[PDB]
Amino acid sequence: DEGETFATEQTTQQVFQKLGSNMENRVCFDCGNKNPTWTSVPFGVMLCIQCSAVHRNMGVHITFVKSSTLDKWTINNLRRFKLGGNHKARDFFLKNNGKQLLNTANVDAKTKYTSPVAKKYKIHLDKKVQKDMELYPSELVLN
Ligand SMILES: [Zn+2]
């Protein structure tokens, strides 16, 4: 549980700075609104304020949200964005015949985030996060 301490603001900023270099991470993963600063932590994706409200209403059983710029981030939570982000998520969905779920319109979020491809992705990302916790138990190392 060495990774449950809160990360420093500069580490938090550098994490989201790194994601921000990829264009996929500059648009909301659910609706494509520009410059999302909210997040769905378990899926490691960036969300606009509106979709942060959609996710919040789904319940913690499915997701929970945090602001990249207004909330304190734990080490373990930041890991999901070192290793995740919108580009990694989208690439997994494309490979796992789930491009229909990536549309910015006419997709219900609960269906999106409880689908098989979504559940396999969270497991995929969870393994990467567990490996990172074992190699880097108390600190967030960018490469
Ligand atoms: Zn959105």
Domain boundaries, the chain: 1-143
Cα dihedral 49/90/111/67 (nearest 10)? -20
Q: State the Cα–Cα distance between residues 138 and 141, nearest whole angstrom.
A: 10
Helices 86-95, 116-135: axis angle to 10 degrees equals 130
Q: What are phi and psi of 50, to 5 degrees?
A: -65, -45
Between the CA of 93 and the centroid of ligand 1 the distance, in Å, is 18
Between the CA of 137 and the centroid of ligand 1 the distance, in Å, is 33
Helix, strand, or coil (residue 109): helix
Between the CA of 136 and the centroid of ligand 1 the distance, in Å, is 32
Between the CA of 98 and the centroid of ligand 1 the distance, in Å, is 18
Q: State the Cα–Cα distance between residues 53 and 132, nearest whole angstrom.
A: 29
What is the DSSP code (8-state) at residue 6? B
Between the CA of 48 and the centroid of ligand 1 the distance, in Å, is 4
DSSP code string of 59-80: -TTT--EEETTTS--BHHHHHH
Between the CA of 34 and the centroid of ligand 1 the distance, in Å, is 9
List the determination method: X-ray
Instruction: Tell me how many degrees the CA angle 110-117-136 measures, rounded to the nearest 5.
Output: 100
Query: Preceding residues of all breaks in the chain (C to N beyond 2.5 angstroms)?
Result: none
Enter the resolution in angstroms.
2.1
Between the CA of 142 and the centroid of ligand 1 the distance, in Å, is 27
Q: State the Cα–Cα distance between residues 68 and 81, nearest whole angstrom.
A: 10
Between the CA of 104 and the centroid of ligand 1 the distance, in Å, is 8
How far is C-alpha 49 from the chain's CA centre? Answer: 14
